[PDB]
Amino acid sequence: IFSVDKVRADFPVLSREVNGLPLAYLDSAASAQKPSQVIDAEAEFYRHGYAAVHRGIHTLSAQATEKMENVRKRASLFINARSAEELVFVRGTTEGINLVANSWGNSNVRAGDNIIISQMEAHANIVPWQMLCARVGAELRVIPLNPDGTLQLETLPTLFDEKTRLLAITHVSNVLGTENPLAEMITLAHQHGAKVLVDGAQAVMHHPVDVQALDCDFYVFSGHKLYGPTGIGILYVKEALLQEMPPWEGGGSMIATVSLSEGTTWTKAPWRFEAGTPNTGGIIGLGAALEYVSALGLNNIAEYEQNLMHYALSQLESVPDLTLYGPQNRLGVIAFNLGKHHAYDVGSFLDNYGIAVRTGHHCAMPLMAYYNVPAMCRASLAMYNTHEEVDRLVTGLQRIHRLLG
Amino acid sequence: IFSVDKVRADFPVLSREVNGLPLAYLDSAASAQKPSQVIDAEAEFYRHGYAAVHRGIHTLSAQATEKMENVRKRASLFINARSAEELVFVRGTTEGINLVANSWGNSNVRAGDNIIISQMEAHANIVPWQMLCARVGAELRVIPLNPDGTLQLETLPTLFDEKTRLLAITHVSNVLGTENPLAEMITLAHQHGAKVLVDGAQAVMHHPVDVQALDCDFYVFSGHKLYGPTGIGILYVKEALLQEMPPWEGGGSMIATVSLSEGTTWTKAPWRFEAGTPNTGGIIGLGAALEYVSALGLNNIAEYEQNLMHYALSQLESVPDLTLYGPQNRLGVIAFNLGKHHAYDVGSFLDNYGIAVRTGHHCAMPLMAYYNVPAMCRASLAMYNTHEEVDRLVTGLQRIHRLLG
Numbered sequence: 001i002f003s004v005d006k007v008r009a010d011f012p013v014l015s016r017e018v019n020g021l022p023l024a025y026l027d028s029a030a031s032a033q034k035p036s037q038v039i040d041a042e043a044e045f046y047r048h049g050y051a052a053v054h055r056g057i058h059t060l061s062a063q064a065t066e067k068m069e070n071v072r073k074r075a076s077l078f079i080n081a082r083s084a085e086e087l088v089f090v091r092g093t094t095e096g097i098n099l100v101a102n103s104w105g106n107s108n109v110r111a112g113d114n115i116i117i118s119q120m121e122a123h124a125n126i127v128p129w130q131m132l133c134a135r136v137g138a139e140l141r142v143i144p145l146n147p148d149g150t151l152q153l154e155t156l157p158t159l160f161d162e163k164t165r166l167l168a169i170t171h172v173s174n175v176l177g178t179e180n181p182l183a184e185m186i187t188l189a190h191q192h193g194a195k196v197l198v199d200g201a202q203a204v205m206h207h208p209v210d211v212q213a214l215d216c217d218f219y220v221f222s223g224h225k226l227y228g229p230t231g232i233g234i235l236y237v238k239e240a241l242l243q244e245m246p247p248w249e250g251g252g253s254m255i256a257t258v259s260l261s262e263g264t265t266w267t268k269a270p271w272r273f274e275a276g277t278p279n280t281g282g283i284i285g286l287g288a289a290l291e292y293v294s295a296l297g298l299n300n301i302a303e304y305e306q307n308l309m310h311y312a313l314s315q316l317e318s319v320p321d322l323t324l325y326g327p328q329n330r331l332g333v334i335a336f337n338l339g340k341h342h343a344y345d346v347g348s349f350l351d352n353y354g355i356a357v358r359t360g361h362h363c364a365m366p367l368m369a370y371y372n373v374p375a376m377c378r379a380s381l382a383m384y385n386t387h388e389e390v391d392r393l394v395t396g397l398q399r400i401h402r403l404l405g
Numbered sequence: 406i407f408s409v410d411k412v413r414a415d416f417p418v419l420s421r422e423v424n425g426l427p428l429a430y431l432d433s434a435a436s437a438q439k440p441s442q443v444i445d446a447e448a449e450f451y452r453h454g455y456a457a458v459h460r461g462i463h464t465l466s467a468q469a470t471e472k473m474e475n476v477r478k479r480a481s482l483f484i485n486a487r488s489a490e491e492l493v494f495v496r497g498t499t500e501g502i503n504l505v506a507n508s509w510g511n512s513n514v515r516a517g518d519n520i521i522i523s524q525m526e527a528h529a530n531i532v533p534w535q536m537l538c539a540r541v542g543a544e545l546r547v548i549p550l551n552p553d554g555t556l557q558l559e560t561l562p563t564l565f566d567e568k569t570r571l572l573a574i575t576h577v578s579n580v581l582g583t584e585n586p587l588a589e590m591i592t593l594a595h596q597h598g599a600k601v602l603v604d605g606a607q608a609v610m611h612h613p614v615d616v617q618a619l620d621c622d623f624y625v626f627s628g629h630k631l632y633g634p635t636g637i638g639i640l641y642v643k644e645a646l647l648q649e650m651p652p653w654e655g656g657g658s659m660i661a662t663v664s665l666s667e668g669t670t671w672t673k674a675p676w677r678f679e680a681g682t683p684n685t686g687g688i689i690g691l692g693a694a695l696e697y698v699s700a701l702g703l704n705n706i707a708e709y710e711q712n713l714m715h716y717a718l719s720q721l722e723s724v725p726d727l728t729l730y731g732p733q734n735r736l737g738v739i740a741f742n743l744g745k746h747h748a749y750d751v752g753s754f755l756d757n758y759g760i761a762v763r764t765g766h767h768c769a770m771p772l773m774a775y776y777n778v779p780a781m782c783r784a785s786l787a788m789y790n791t792h793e794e795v796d797r798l799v800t801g802l803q804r805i806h807r808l809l810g
């Protein structure tokens with residue numbers, strides 16, 4: 001079983017003080033703190049093994065190339081992909097969705113077709129599809145929300161038809177913590193010959209993820225939310241689809257031959273999708289992050305996090321005029337507003353107590369408009385957060401209510 | 406003046422042993438080793454100040470946002486750009502050229518137009534233009550090479566006409582070390598109303614670069630060749646051009662408003678070109694790399710490197726059957742083949758002596774075809790390399806010639 005005290009000892013930032021007070025970092029959903037095992041893995045690579053990685057002849061470059069492809073394999077086992085060659089290294093979830101929207105979207109979505117997203121999507125999983133629809137003359141359809149923060153699944157019959165080419169859907173909402181019924185939705189999408197891209201950026205740190213069981217066609221997530229470095233993420237694509245997709249970015253290392261008189265030919269996937277020097281440092285650090293999370297055990301993480309979440313929700317019942325958004329069985333995050341005070345003010349008072357929460361629209365403006373608010377507060381309850389930090393949040397909201405009420 | 410011994414003491418990898426022998430790292434042109442000042446700046450950020458950076462309310466996120474924009478300003482002063490808002494953070498030179506080719510290229514190059522590159526370009530500065538020309542139906546013209554590795558500038562009158570929209574040209578060749586006469590070529594390009602993108606990935610570590618003096622329209626370089634981390638680079642664009650360019654990648658943080666019924670609007674440049682979570686760790690490390698290089702002094706670096714290069718070229722005269730490629734006044738790199746032995750074999754013997762050189766086509770196949778070889782060796786002579794390392798290279802080539810001749 002899990003011991004939050006030993007876990008916290010791996011995270012140096014958690015010793016930090018903010019505004020003279022001990023930091024309570026409740027913003028992991030915006031980005032996760034990193035353990036020293038991850039920080040030092042990157043640092044030690046730069047200190048002792050660094051080189052360029054294009055199967056270079058000399059030793060450092062050959063060894064670096066092998067470390068990178070080892071991380072690709074470790075990542076593929078983490079999400080239970082059938083093959084390491086189904087994974088592309090991207091800068092993050094956002095770049096991965098843009099890669100699909102251009103390479104796959106431009107070749108498979110035509111004027112008169114439609115694409116389906118949900119009203120809870122983050123902007124990362126909205127804007128690239130809006131751009132695609134405008135490029136090719138297709139229509140963007142939206143699964144709407146229920147008041148409790150779940151999808152109105154009853155509307156799916158009116159949204160899916162013969163011309164639906166793609167469903168793009170979040171696994172876990174970055175605002176509400178809603179977890180969507182992906183496996184059933186993917187069965188329905190496949191019945192119409194539509195593909196499914198899953199935005200899993202908020203799912204992969206809370207419980208095991210299995211893309212063969214899901215049967216999704218595309219899956220994306222970001223290293224920096226998985227206790228890993230910035231600048232690196234993973235795009236999974238089914239081998240049969242990936243092998244047919246044209247390149248997006250052009251340049252070195254994604255070509256087979258370059259000729260100025262007879263044109264250029266591309267290499268095989270996944271390397272066809274990785275142009276120029278990869279983010280080798282980020283890849284090393286991501287691999288260490290996967291090892292760290294796997295050693296703790298995602299089912300142990302899930303169990304501790306669910307207990308912490310149940311504790312928080314129970315304690316927050318004693319905050320007057322607190323509005324919560326989303327379902328009772330939320331994962332990871334609690335979205336809320338305090339009476340009629342603006343989220344910006346509530347977040348500033350919490351920061352002044354040393355408590356980091358996120359405020360604003362959370363890169364989900366359509367979700368804010370559904371609830372008819374301009375902004376919300378969001379507290380993240382991650383694997384290194386404690387009952388004590390929950391108590392500080394509850395007390396701070398109580399103090400803020402008294403002071404400003 | 407410069408002291409190579411004190412500089413080398415900052416680079417931990419240089420203590421390394423390869424194949425039981427002390428490493429002589431002569432492959433900085435593929436990627437540079439990093440000083441501990443750069444390694445520790447990134448590590449310390451992750452250890453003590455890490456957070457998401459979208460002008461978040463709480464302290465860590467506000468401070469992180471300020472560090473990032475401070476690096477943007479430091480980068481702009483490094484290349485003497487007029488404004489920090491003329492710089493976009495990209496993954497590297499390759500991604501920056503693809504950004505221009507799509508955002509600017511798609512809006513400004515039409516069927517029947519032409520683009521001009523050179524025969525010495527790296528694939529990074531070839532393939533995106535081939536893709537653009539195929540997208541819009543334009544023609545890709547090529548400045549050819551002279552036997553000494555310089556451009557045949559006499560052909561420019563036949564290549565520039567009324568329909569030339571862009572010159573894309575390398576500042577310093579990554580294979581030959583040729584430095585092109587950029588300022589004169591840019592004057593000529595501008596006389597026809599063509600823009601100029603400069604690939605400066607091999608220039609920015611050897612001597613000062615001044616984009617106002619150059620008057621180029623676009624300029625790109627990579628952090629990892631400037632003694633900095635992987636996964637980060639800089640795209641400079643003249644403010645008047647950048648302000649008119651449409652977004653490329655879509656997602657969070659590059660929007661002004663997102664609506665599913667009234668469409669989406671974009672924020673101002675440069676932030677319109679930076680979608681999703683930036684590579685904050687890479688940016689911190691790049692800023693430290695610029696400070697480190699500036700503290701040493703690029704004119705001091707240039708002076709030491711030119712002396713080392715003159716020494717190497719003089720010593721290599723005693724290697725039998727050595728073919729050199731490129732001009733006598735090369736910067737940074739020496740391209741060579743040894744008699745009729747394949748570069749791959751020569752590089753393997755050098756690696757076996759602990760000497761790291763690069764072999765192959767160096768992501769410049771058209772350049773290899775111009776010289777009618779399949780591959781070359783390339784030794785990089787950077788600011789932390791020594792006369793002793795040159796002597797080891799010369800001796801190794803002599804031994805290899807005797808053994809295999």
Ligand SMILES: *Cc1c(COP(=O)(O)O)cnc(C)c1O
Nearest residue numbers: 276277497498499529579606627
């Ligand atoms: C290495 C290099 C590139 C590629 O830069 P990346 O960081 O790999 O994207 C482009 N042009 C030149 C001249 C280079 O030396």
Ligand SMILES: *Cc1c(COP(=O)(O)O)cnc(C)c1O
Nearest residue numbers: 092093094124174201222681682
């Ligand atoms: C944060 C997040 C993203 C954006 O990921 P980046 O790493 O910033 O590219 C996309 N979708 C969801 C659900 C997220 O939580």
Ligand SMILES: [Cl-]
Nearest residue numbers: 252253528768
């Ligand atoms: Cl290549």
Ligand SMILES: [Cl-]
Nearest residue numbers: 123363657658
């Ligand atoms: Cl946003």
